[PDB]
Every structure is written in structure tokens, then in C-alpha cells.
């Protein structure tokens, strides 16, 4: 992992949310470049989210 | 011997191989029915068969 810097539409929306609803954030990118689907795992013949 | 879980797995394989995907579970208060129902539900939920 390397610390890069992110910005854009979603980051501005998140900053506005943190301003309105008083909380602090720690942003990190998802390990793989996948949004997420229910995929079959090759162990136990199960389905899981990635 | 075979535990009730393995017998349930074989029964589900039987139902799958003959395309009997619609079924009902009828049990009494006989001991071991809790584990039987739990295993059947767990196998059904973590399955892509439908
Ligand atoms: C808004 O954020 C401020 C941070 O400045 C919160 O103030 C903190 O309040 C907590 C308890 O709620 C204290 O433990 C901290 O010492 C406070 N920090 C400072 C320096 O103010 C405030 O609570 C937040 N507003 C809310 C969520 O009520
Ligand atoms: C099989 O699954 C393991 C983890 O369960 C994964 O690391 C591996 O890449 C998989 N093999 C494939 C997708 O060919």
C-alpha cells in the first residue's frame, strides 16, 4: 500500500457530509478494482461478496 | 457411519440430480431436528442452485 491523494465529486460530497454530520474519515482504496458482485468461491462451493 | 449433516447433503444431491428444486421440510421434535433444519437452511442459503 502507498498513500496517494484522491479528489473529485465523491470526495467533495464526503467532505460536505463530514462537515454536516460531525465525524472524521480515513479514506482508503479497495484492494481490487472491482465494485463488488456475488461470486462463487472455489472453497466449500459458497458464494461471497468481493 | 454418517452424521445427519452428511445424510442431508446426500439427500440434497439426490434432489438436485433429479431437478426437484421445490421441496418442503417436515420435522418433529425428535432430537437432532434443530441441527437438521439449521444445516438444510445453511446449505440452501449458500447455494447457486436456486
Ligand atoms: C463536533 O466536533 C467537535 C470536535 O472539535 C466535537 O468536540 C468534541 O466533543 C467530544 C465529546 O463529544 C470531546 O471528547 C472532545 O474533546 C471535543 N473536541 C473538541 C476539541 O471540541 C463535538 O462533540 C462535535 N459535535 C458533536 C458531534 O456533538
Ligand atoms: C481459489 O480460491 C483462492 C481463495 O479461496 C484464491 O486465492 C484463488 O485465486 C482461487 N483460484 C482461482 C480463482 O483460480
TrEMBL record, chain B:
Compartment(s) where it occurs, according to its Swiss-Prot or TrEMBL record: Cell projection, Dendritic spine; Cytoplasmic vesicle membrane; Postsynaptic cell membrane
Q: What does this protein do?
A: Receptor for glutamate that functions as a ligand-gated ion channel in the central nervous system and plays an important role in excitatory synaptic transmission. L-glutamate acts as an excitatory neurotransmitter at many synapses in the central nervous system.
Recorded family membership? Belongs to the glutamate-gated ion channel (TC 1.A.10.1) family. NR2A/GRIN2A subfamily.
Output this protein's name.
Glutamate receptor
What organism does this protein naturally occur in?
A: Rattus norvegicus
Q: What is the lineage of its organism?
A: Eukaryota, Metazoa, Chordata, Craniata, Vertebrata
